[PDB]
Every structure is written in C-alpha cells, then in structure tokens.
Amino acid sequence: RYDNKFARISDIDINQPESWRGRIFLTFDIDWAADFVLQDTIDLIEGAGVCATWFATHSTPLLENIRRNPLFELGVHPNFNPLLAGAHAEGVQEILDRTLELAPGCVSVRSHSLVQATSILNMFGERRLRYDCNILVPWDAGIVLQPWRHWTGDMVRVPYLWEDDVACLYDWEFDSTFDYWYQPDGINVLDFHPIHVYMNTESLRRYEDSREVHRNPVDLIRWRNTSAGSRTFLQSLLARNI
Amino acid sequence: RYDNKFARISDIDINQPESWRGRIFLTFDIDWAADFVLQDTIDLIEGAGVCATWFATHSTPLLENIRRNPLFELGVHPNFNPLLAGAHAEGVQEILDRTLELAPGCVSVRSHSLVQATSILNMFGERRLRYDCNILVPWDAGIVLQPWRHWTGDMVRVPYLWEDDVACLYDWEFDSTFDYWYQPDGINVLDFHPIHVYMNTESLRRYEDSREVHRNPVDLIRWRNTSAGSRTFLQSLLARNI
Numbered sequence: 168r169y170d171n172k173f174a175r176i177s178d179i180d181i182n183q184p185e186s187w188r189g190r191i192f193l194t195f196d197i198d199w200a201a202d203f204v205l206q207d208t209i210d211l212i213e214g215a216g217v218c219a220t221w222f223a224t225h226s227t228p229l230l231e232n233i234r235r236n237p238l239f240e241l242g243v244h245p246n247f248n249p250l251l252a253g254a255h256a257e258g259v260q261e262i263l264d265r266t267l268e269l270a271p272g273c274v275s276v277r278s279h280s281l282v283q284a285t286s287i288l289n290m291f292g293e294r295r296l297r298y299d300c301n302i303l304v305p306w307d308a309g310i311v312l313q314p315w316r317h318w319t320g321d322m323v324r325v326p327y328l329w330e331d332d333v334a335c336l337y338d339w340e341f342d343s344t345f346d347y348w349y350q351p352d353g354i355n356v357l358d359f360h361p362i363h364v365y366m367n368t369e370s371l372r373r374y375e376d377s378r379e380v381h382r383n384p385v386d387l388i389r390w391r392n393t394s395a396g397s398r399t400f401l402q403s404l405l406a407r408n409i
Numbered sequence: 410r411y412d413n414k415f416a417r418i419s420d421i422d423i424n425q426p427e428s429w430r431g432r433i434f435l436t437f438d439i440d441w442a443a444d445f446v447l448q449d450t451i452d453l454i455e456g457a458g459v460c461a462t463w464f465a466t467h468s469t470p471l472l473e474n475i476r477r478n479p480l481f482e483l484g485v486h487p488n489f490n491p492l493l494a495g496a497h498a499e500g501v502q503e504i505l506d507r508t509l510e511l512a513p514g515c516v517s518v519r520s521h522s523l524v525q526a527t528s529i530l531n532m533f534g535e536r537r538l539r540y541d542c543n544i545l546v547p548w549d550a551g552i553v554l555q556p557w558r559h560w561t562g563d564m565v566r567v568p569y570l571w572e573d574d575v576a577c578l579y580d581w582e583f584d585s586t587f588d589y590w591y592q593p594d595g596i597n598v599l600d601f602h603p604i605h606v607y608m609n610t611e612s613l614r615r616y617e618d619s620r621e622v623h624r625n626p627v628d629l630i631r632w633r634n635t636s637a638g639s640r641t642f643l644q645s646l647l648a649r650n651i
C-alpha cells in the first residue's frame with residue numbers, strides 16, 4: 168500500500184521498483200549510545216508504529232527489542248576506523264566477523280564513518296550481507312536516487328540522502344514545513360543517531376559541549392535543544408507521513 | 410564549446426553546470442603499469458588530441474609527459490588496501506602523504522580499490538585535494554549523475570559511471586554501435602586501466618592468465634584480444650566524439 172510509506176532496508180526488491188519508489192526508509196546508526204538513549208529512540212519509533220532498520224555497534228539487551236519487533240530490521244555497523252587511524256594488529260575480516268556476532272544472519276550493513284572499499288564489499292557479500300548502505304548522495308545534489316545491483320555477492324547498493332549530523336555540517340533546515348528532501352520518484356533513506364534524537368541536536372557544538380554527559384541518564388536530558396533539531400524533524404516527518 | 414566534449418576533472422566548476430553537463434571525462438587509473446604499457450595508453454589519447462585525467466600510483470618518468478601536456482591533468486591513486494588486509498604499521502596519513510609526493514599541488518584523487526571513509530575525505534581536504542572521484546554509480550542504474558559539494562574541505566564529489574574491469578564483471582558490451590552509457594543531461598566519467606587498454610581486455614580471465622607477462626614488452630602484445638574489448642571501446646568512443 169502507497170499508504171505503507173515506511174519500510175525496512177530488506178524490503179527492497181531490486182526487481183520491483185514498487186518496493187522502494189517514493190518510500191521512506193528510516194535507518195538508525197546506534198553509534199555506541201547508552202541504553203537509556205537507545206531506548207528513547209526505540210520508544211519514539213514504536214510509538215509511531217512504523218518500520219525501521221537499526222545498525223548495531225555493540226552488544227546490548229536492547230538489540231532483542233529490535234529483533235522482536237516485526238517492523239524492525241537489525242543490521243550491523245562495523246567500525247574499521249582503527250585500521251585507518253594508524254598501526255593496527257588486525258584487518259577488516261576480524262572486525263567484520265566480530266560485529267556480525269551481534270546479528271547472525273542479518274542482511275544489511277552500513278559502516279561506521281562510511282568506511283568502504285571493493286574488498287570490503289566483497290567480504291560483506293561472502294558473509295551473506297545483501298544490502299550495502301554506505302553511499303550518501305545528498306538530497307540537494309539534484310540526483311534522483313535508486314538502489315542498484317553491485318557487481319559481486321548479489322549485493323544491492325542502497326544510497327541515502329539525509330543524515331542528522333550531516334544536516335548540521337551542510338546547514339540543512341530542521342524546521343521546514345515540508346519534506347524538502349523527498350523524492351516521490353526515488354528511494355528515500357534517512358540516517359539518524361539516537362544521541363542526536365535524544366538531544367534534539369541542531370548544532371554539533373551542543374554534541375561536543377555535552378560529551379562528558381552522553382552516558383549520564385540524570386543530566387543528559389538538561390541538554391535537550393528546545394528549538395527545532397533532529398528530534399523535532401523526526402517527529403514531524405513521522406506525524407506527516409503516518 | 411559543446412564540441413569540446415572531453416574535459417579534465419579539474420575543469421568541473423560546481424557553480425556552472427555547463428562545465429560538466431553532457432561532457433566526457435576520460436580518467437586513467439595507472440595501477441602500477443609497466444612504462445611500455447602506460448606509454449601505449451598515453452600515445453593513444455595524445456593521438457586523439459583530447460583532455461584526460463591520470464591517477465598516479467608510482468614514480469615513473471612518464472608522469473612528466475602527463476604534466477607537460479596541457480590537456481592532461483595528473484592526480485593521485487593512493488593505495489590503502491594494506492590497511493584493510495591485516496596488521497600494518499601505518500595509517501592513511503603516511504600512505505597519502507607519500508602518494509602526494511608524486512604530484513605536488515594536485516587537486517584530484519581516486520583511491521585504489523575505491524577505499525574511502527569520512528576521515529579519508531577529511532584528510533584529502535586538509536591536503537588541498539578538491540575533487541574526490543571514488544563514487545561509482547553504474548551507467549545502467551537509472552540515475553542521472555551530477556557532481557556535488559562535499560560537507561568538508563570545499564571538496565567536490567565526482568561520481569563515475571563506467572570502468573573497464575567493472576564492465577567485464579557486469580557483462581557490459583564492448584562492441585555496441587552507440588554510447589549506451591552517455592548522459593546528455595549528466596556528468597560522464599569513465600575509468601580505464603592502461604593494462605586493459607594494452608591487452609584490449611574483454612574478460613578478466615585474459616588478464617589473470619597473462620599475469621606473468623604484464624611487464625614483458627616482447628610477449629605481452631601476443632595476448633592482445635583481436636575481438637572487441639576495452640581498447641576498441643575506447644578507440645570507438647574517441648572516433649565518434651572528436
């Protein structure tokens with residue numbers, strides 16, 4: 168149903184454009200959020216009653232909440248940054264295999280910091296991942312987006328067009344009265360972080376200033392932006408589209 | 410002039426679509442080709458008298474040929490694969506800085522194996538690179554392509570839509586009578602490797618079977634495909650568009 172606007176990444180059927188065209192795919196890069204922060208984001212999406220895909224960074228009992236919910240897909244968020252940062256004892260394989268232990272049998276992946284390479288995608292495919300979510304093409308680039316077949320692993324590359332922290336870096340609006348990014352004729356994948364939904368981030372300086380409080384369940388709420396930000400953007404998007 | 414169809418990557422002016430729309434950007438990932446192989450590719454493009462951009466992997470006096478030619482732009486092709494392959498003593502910075510020594514002041518980059526990440530692009534930008542050429546969106550994905558502004562470094566991301574070895578993996582045609590990939594309304598960046606132009610590669614098995622001969626100036630020519638392949642595709646594209 169057209170009215171079923173929200174979908175999971177694994178609902179994309181590359182052979183059937185009806186499975187993605189004009190639809191919205193809410194995705195969440197967990198990024199090591201404390202449990203109270205992740206729980207708040209889960210509660211917000213569960214309250215809307217929509218589908219969503221969650222990319223896991225670490226082990227937490229809240230992953231079981233995500234697994235249970237039939238509207239939610241659990242994927243992985245492997246962190247290969249230490250490989251790029253300087254000398255290291257391991258490669259991609261060890262890190263990927265460890266991350267996959269968080270969601271055995273999953274099919275969707277987005278790399279922390281969008282770390283990607285031909286060999287990385289080859290290794291994703293060997294491990295039976297089917298959807299790569301690592302290409303970010305901005306909604307304002309003038310490009311109508313569509314997922315496409317990768318040349319190996321029967322993988323599908325799924326490009327995404329909006330991200331909360333990226334919106335801060337590009338100075339995109341959090342308080343527009345319409346879905347400026349929306350493509351009725353393309354795929355619409357958005358990426359949110361629980362930390363920014365929790366603090367209603369409108370500037371990364373709020374995020375940086377509050378660093379010491381990000382895991383403090385008593386004080387963090389005091390840093391929530393009361394103007395427009397990531398949280399109010401998500402809340403409006405949900406209200407307008409359910 | 411519309412008739413000046415061929416351009417260099419650094420000719421892209423993100424503020425002026427006339428600088429890229431409907432134009433063709435021939436790019437060459439040198440990939441450690443022996444000098445006789447690189448020379449053959451240079452001779453072929455020089456014979457056509459068109460612009461081209463060359464991504465350097467290693468030091469060779471032939472880079473000076475590329476620098477001299479005012480129609481040619483020299484960029485870099487850093488190799489970060491060893492970082493992903495397993496334990497390593499260095500990170501991106503050391504490798505990038507060493508590669509940049511091959512073309513000081515250059516502005517364009519494509520990573521070997523399309524290794525990329527947010528921190529990698531940040532580091533490209535700090536080193537005054539302006540054009541990232543690491544996003545490959547296939548010509549047959551149904552997406553009209555345009556370069557776009559990256560969120561840091563005043564960098565421009567330039568997507569490309571065709572590559573010789575990728576054409577083999579996707580089973581794209583080398584002997585079409587028309588430019589099937591061409592977007593009159595988008596940017597058209599193609600990536601060729603000197604080794605495949607030299608051997609007129611139509612299957613990667615030819616490339617793999619001939620491995621021991623890739624630096625043998627006497628025997629390699631015997632492995633050149635006499636049917637349609639990467640070389641005849643490039644030759645036709647040049648003939649049709651000059």
Ligand SMILES: [Zn+2]
Nearest residue numbers: 196198279280
């Ligand atoms: Zn992340």
Ligand SMILES: [Zn+2]
Nearest residue numbers: 438440521522
């Ligand atoms: Zn290469």
